[PDB]
Design a protein around this ligand. Structure first.
Ligand SMILES: [Cl-]
Ligand SMILES: [Cl-]
Ligand SMILES: [Cl-]
Ligand SMILES: [Mg+2]
Ligand SMILES: [Mg+2]
Ligand SMILES: [Mg+2]
Ligand SMILES: [Mg+2]
Ligand SMILES: [Mg+2]
Ligand SMILES: [Mg+2]
Ligand SMILES: [Mg+2]
Ligand SMILES: [Mg+2]
Ligand SMILES: [Mg+2]
Ligand SMILES: [Mg+2]
Ligand SMILES: [Mg+2]
Ligand SMILES: [Mg+2]
Ligand SMILES: [Mg+2]
Ligand SMILES: [Mg+2]
Ligand code: NA
Ligand code: NA
Ligand code: NA
Ligand code: NA
Ligand code: NA
Ligand code: NA
Ligand code: NA
Ligand code: NA
Ligand code: NA
Ligand code: NA
Ligand code: NA
Ligand code: NA
Ligand code: NA
Ligand code: NA
Ligand code: NA
Ligand code: NA
Ligand code: NA
Ligand code: NA
Ligand code: NA
Ligand code: NA
Ligand code: NA
Lengths: 246, 115, 145, 119
RNA sequence: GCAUGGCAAGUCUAACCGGAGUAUCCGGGGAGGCACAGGGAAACCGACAUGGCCGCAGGGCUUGCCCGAGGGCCGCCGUC
RNA sequence: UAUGCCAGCUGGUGGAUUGCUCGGCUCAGGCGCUGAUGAAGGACGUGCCAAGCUGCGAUAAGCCAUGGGGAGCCGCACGGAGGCGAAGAACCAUGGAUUUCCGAAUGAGAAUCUCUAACAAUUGCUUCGCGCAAUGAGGAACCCCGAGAACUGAAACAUCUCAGUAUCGGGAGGAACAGAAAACGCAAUGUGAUGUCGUUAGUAACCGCGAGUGAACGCGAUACAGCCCAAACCGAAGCCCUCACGGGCAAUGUGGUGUCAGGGCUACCUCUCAUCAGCCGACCGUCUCGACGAAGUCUCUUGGAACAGAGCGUGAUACAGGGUGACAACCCCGUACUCGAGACCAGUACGACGUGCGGUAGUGCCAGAGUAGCGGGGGUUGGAUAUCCCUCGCGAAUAACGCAGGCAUCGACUGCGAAGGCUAAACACAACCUGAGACCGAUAGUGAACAAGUAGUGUGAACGAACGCUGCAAAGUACCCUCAGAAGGGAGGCGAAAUAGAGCAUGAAAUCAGUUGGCGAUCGAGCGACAGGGCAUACAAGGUCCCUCGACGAAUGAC
């Protein structure tokens, strides 16, 4: 198909062929499996102290005093799981493998498939993104990689009728639950992914909900956050070309 | 509890064809695809070459693999083909998707099932 | 929902009488205990059998059937064509950590083949010659007498 | 440290000299322009305007600055005790704006003016 | 064992290396594993890409008659 | 209708629940020894008032210097009084001063005190004098060398297994240990010090051949590094102390040479870029710390308070996180960017100084003994005839010799020189620094968020809790009445709220007081389910229900 290239003013400036991969049949099940793994693979091993509740010589009096055979020390029950201050019967364990494997092929196929869902304006709209454009992904001249101010990327985005998505991500949610106590107080919608070629866009990164990636290592997660296909993306002339062989 | 959205649709399409058109193979293939993957067909070229005949579409209710040699000029329809299978077959015949078969022949006529 | 997920409330978790799931007594003893007594059933009988030759006095032959060579002659475009001629040693995988390469005669031979290997089986020769071919024994193959 | 516990901790246990940064207030438009700084460490000499409390709107001279409790006393910003006495209502510098500076210190004034350091 | 999914006469990398958005992730790494032939204690030898018959589904036909993958019963082949 | 039953209401008791997190748990990166120059630990002191904790040591919550920092300060700890600070205090970094007694504890003794100069004790050197030195003890585990169970498993049990585990003895370091082949033995025209990771492989091997046990070579990686003696041949050409003088060591050999690319000697060729000794001496990276650091505190509404709603506007290489009277990029700390410092890498790499590498021919000059090896008895190992080690006895060769290649002997072949020594880097732990989290959230998570190894128990070894939350701000309740009264109560005052009033957020159940509805002093006990009546009921969140008649009318079905 055809890809309408845009200049830093938001005006058409020729067009390149949309590489084949963007024709890869969208497979949300495979994409979901790729995200699930990436999300599990960064989780940290945890678990209670091996000896928590075992540091005591408590013993059971056995039969004879009208008491249950529960280990006690200084007339206080201990160790056993039903006892306050006792061990945890089946606790979290450091030894547990909390990682998920995934065949390279299966994962690469998901990458290609997520790439392809990027070229479907309907999917992109269903995923939730706000925009008033018909073509997608949004391809742009390699000059984008030279921008330096966030504000400049804003103008370009407004010119491309895509800034509305950032308006969407411009709202943080204060989550329900104790995550807050561990530093996960906030969360926010995912907006535009900017795929460049030489280096992530320093100029676009701070944009509400924006994520910056590079064509050689852009993955399933940035292409389909949370395993949902169809993220409103903006590639770079050269980015678009590199992505082709992924 | 199938997971693949594509395999899921194919199955629904195969049913629509066996019901509307006079087809019986399509509903037959649809039932076998609904069964556990372990039971689906995994056929090599050697077997297609042995029981197929020209002008009679070979229908594999599974997947075709590239072991062995195929000389007959047949049209094979499968859920999928390994890269090699599809290459060898197109050299002397034609590899087709079940989705195309259902279209070019909704009455599923002059078809031979191979597993 | 899984089986495990539905156990809460069942008391026994499918073990029957609560007097069942205790120690190893419920398994007739730890591990293979009783493999000659109460649980002899389905255990290979006790006993010693045969002998082994030292690992480094053993030879491992790298084999291949004519059917494999033959089914891919055309495809082996990167290998001699003549009146085809293929050096088996260059076809067989594992042909390095192998003491030698041997051609076995399973399948058919639909071409005239000139095969070079360290060894062949009667069936392999008959088949390769019967299809108007020849079999050449390597120098290593010069170990027949 | 992105962890809330560690952030609050370091703020509550910061040594005395690191507490000056907990008693800083935004400068008025004029002062910002004059010295090229957005805020300054409120001093017991400065004049300030309350922008948030119940006393929002009122202005007065800073009477006291407690580093430990990171709080300031502003003249006339007080509470009526039961016995009738009038005591100060501690304010957080964050709800305050410095409209006038007490620059009797060569060092403070120097810091204010230099462009490589802030006061 | 089973359900689902990728690839398929193959399949998967391990430690580790490079990159990076730096525990995630992208690229590399097939060492080695299992599968691709078995039988024999060992020496050692080394197999049906189909020869026959029933016949389900399915297909065909001039509507019982053919073709009949899978399945079933035989032959035949490797080795002790 | 007393005693009383059931449910509720008002107040209480209690402290669940929800919300909150100054603590835990776990993972990761960095870093890593201290002590006779008396450590670590403990005791007792030390404040204006000082009991606990922290700090400190008779200079006692401290003294000095340099740098940073800054208008405040006098620890936790918010009182009273008083004081310190522009003579630049507080506070932070580095360095220095002080640093009681016990404590390895060392003059001798002793439950932290005492008696009349002290390296006690054991050693090395030695001016043979404690003159110069060493050792001792600590440390979270990690590490190395010795000693070494049993429960248990085998459905009993003895070998086996648990297990070379637990525990004990001795000792090192920041890492240990190992290490440049008398190797390997994919047997080869092959590999080439050592750890470690992955694999080889639950393979080979062991085993009442039961249960169980269990490698290696090699391969892919990580990191890489290779050398010094003894002797031959030389023979005082040497070394240590001392500023020197002088002394001490050393022919029982200091020093030169040399170390399987064997060496020495004799005659030659060429040459040094090997090695060894010593000099200099980092970049980068990584860890931590620090400097600077953009943009609203505008309007209306609600509110005790705007960080809320609506409206207008701004920054962003910064939309991580935290604070601030409620949901904050723009109010404050910080965050991106840029920059600086210390530590580690490392006395390493690089560079340089000195030395001199190597080759030919001749020469039976040299080359580590209770050894190699055999036997008796044991332990250990997968080690089976073929693991490693101990013990008693026996016991060789000399490179023209010897050992190994998984039974012995002889020959061949291939590999390799034991019985002397050193050796960076890659790997273990987690005390210490920092970071992180699909971990817990106060009966949880450490025993310990609090006085925590505290209170307390035991002669002792040892054992060992519970206790988090006023409020935006103390505005922490003046005055008056009452009272034996700084109690309590009444009235009153503060605040959005006192039913936030002090172990004070919320405030469940069991349960208590008062009280409301129903029952009730002639009557029977799984406390109810389902039907149906009485009596009782503010709203809300349910709105149906009753009777005449009529329509429809399954099975059944009359007078
Ligand atoms: Cl097949
Ligand atoms: Cl064998
Ligand atoms: Cl080798
Ligand atoms: Mg516990
Ligand atoms: Mg909740
Ligand atoms: Mg290989
Ligand atoms: Mg300034
Ligand atoms: Mg003494
Ligand atoms: Mg037993
Ligand atoms: Mg037995
Ligand atoms: Mg063992
Ligand atoms: Mg070996
Ligand atoms: Mg020497
Ligand atoms: Mg043993
Ligand atoms: Mg607790
Ligand atoms: Mg006792
Ligand atoms: Mg309360
Ligand atoms: Na304890
Ligand atoms: Na009881
Ligand atoms: Na783990
Ligand atoms: Na069961
Ligand atoms: Na049970
Ligand atoms: Na058993
Ligand atoms: Na038996
Ligand atoms: Na391989
Ligand atoms: Na350290
Ligand atoms: Na005190
Ligand atoms: Na001191
Ligand atoms: Na001493
Ligand atoms: Na002496
Ligand atoms: Na037993
Ligand atoms: Na017994
Ligand atoms: Na045994
Ligand atoms: Na090899
Ligand atoms: Na504020
Ligand atoms: Na012996
Ligand atoms: Na050897
Ligand atoms: Na508690």
């Amino acid at each position: 198909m055809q890809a309408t290239i845009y200049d830093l003013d938001g005006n058409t400036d020729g067009e390149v062929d949309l590489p084949d991969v963007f024709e890869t049949p969208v497979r949300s099940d495979l994409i979901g499996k790729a995200v699930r793994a990436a999300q599990a693979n960064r989780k940290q091993d945890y678990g209670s102290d091996e000896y928590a509740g075992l540091r005591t010589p408590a013993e059971s009096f056995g039969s004879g005093r009208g008491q249950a055979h529960v280990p006690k020390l200084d007339g206080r029950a201990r160790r056993v799981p039903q006892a306050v201050k006792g061990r945890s019967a089946h606790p979290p364990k450091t030894e547990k493998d909390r990682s998920l494997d995934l065949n390279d092929k299966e994962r690469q196929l998901a990458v290609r498939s997520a790439l392809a869902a990027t070229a479907d304006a309907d999917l992109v709209a269903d995923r939730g993104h706000e925009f008033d454009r018909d073509e997608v992904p949004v391809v742009v001249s390699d000059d984008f990689e030279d921008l330096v101010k966030t504000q400049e990327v804003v103008s370009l985005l407004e010119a491309l009728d895509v800034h509305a998505d950032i308006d969407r991500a411009d709202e943080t949610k204060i989550k329900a639950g104790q995550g807050s106590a561990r530093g996960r107080k906030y969360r926010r919608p995912a907006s535009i992914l900017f795929v460049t070629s030489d280096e992530p866009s320093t100029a676009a990164r701070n944009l509400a909900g924006a994520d910056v990636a590079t064509a050689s290592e852009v993955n399933t997660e940035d292409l389909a956050p949370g395993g949902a296909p169809g993220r409103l993306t903006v590639f770079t002339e050269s980015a678009l070309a590199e992505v082709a062989e992924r | 509890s199938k997971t693949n959205p594509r395999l899921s649709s194919l199955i629904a399409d195969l049913k629509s064809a066996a019901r509307s058109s006079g087809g019986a193979v399509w509903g037959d293939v649809a039932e076998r695809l609904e069964k556990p993957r372990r039971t689906h067909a995994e056929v090599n070229l050697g077997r297609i070459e042995r029981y197929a005949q020209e002008d009679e579409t070979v229908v594999v209710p599974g997947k075709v693999l590239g072991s062995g040699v195929l000389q007959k000029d047949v049209t094979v329809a499968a859920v999928d083909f390994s890269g090699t299978a599809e290459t060898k077959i197109d050299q002397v015949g034609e590899a087709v998707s079940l989705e195309q078969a259902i279209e070019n022949n909704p009455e599923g006529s002059h078809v031979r099932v191979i597993r | 929902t899984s089986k495990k997920k539905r156990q809460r409330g069942s008391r026994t978790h499918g073990g029957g009488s609560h007097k069942n799931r205790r120690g190893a007594g419920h398994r007739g003893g730890r591990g293979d205990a009783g493999r000659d007594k109460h649980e002899f059933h389905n255990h290979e009988p006790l006993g010693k059998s045969g002998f082994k030759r030292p690992q480094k006095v053993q030879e491992e032959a790298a084999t291949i059937d004519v059917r494999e060579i033959d089914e891919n002659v055309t495809l082996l475009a990167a290998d001699d064509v003549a009146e085809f001629r293929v050096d088996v040693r260059d076809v067989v995988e594992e042909a390095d950590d192998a003491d030698y390469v041997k051609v076995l005669g399973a399948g058919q031979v639909r071409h005239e083949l000139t095969l070079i290997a360290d060894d062949f089986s009667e069936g392999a020769r008959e088949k390769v010659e019967g299809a108007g071919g020849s079999v050449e024994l390597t120098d290593l193959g010069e170990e027949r007498q | 440290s992105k962890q809330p516990d560690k952030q609050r901790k370091s703020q509550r246990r910061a040594p005395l000299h690191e507490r000056h940064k907990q008693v800083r207030a935004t400068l008025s438009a004029d002062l910002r322009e004059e010295y090229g700084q957005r805020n300054v460490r409120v001093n017991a000499g400065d004049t300030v305007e309350v922008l948030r409390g119940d006393f929002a709107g009122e202005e007065g001279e800073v009477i006291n600055v407690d580093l430990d409790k990171a709080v300031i006393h502003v003249e006339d910003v007080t509470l009526e005790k039961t016995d009738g006495e009038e005591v100060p209502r501690p304010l957080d510098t964050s709800n305050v704006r410095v409209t006038d500076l007490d620059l009797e210190d060569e060092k403070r004034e120097a810091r204010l003016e230099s462009e490589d350091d802030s006061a």
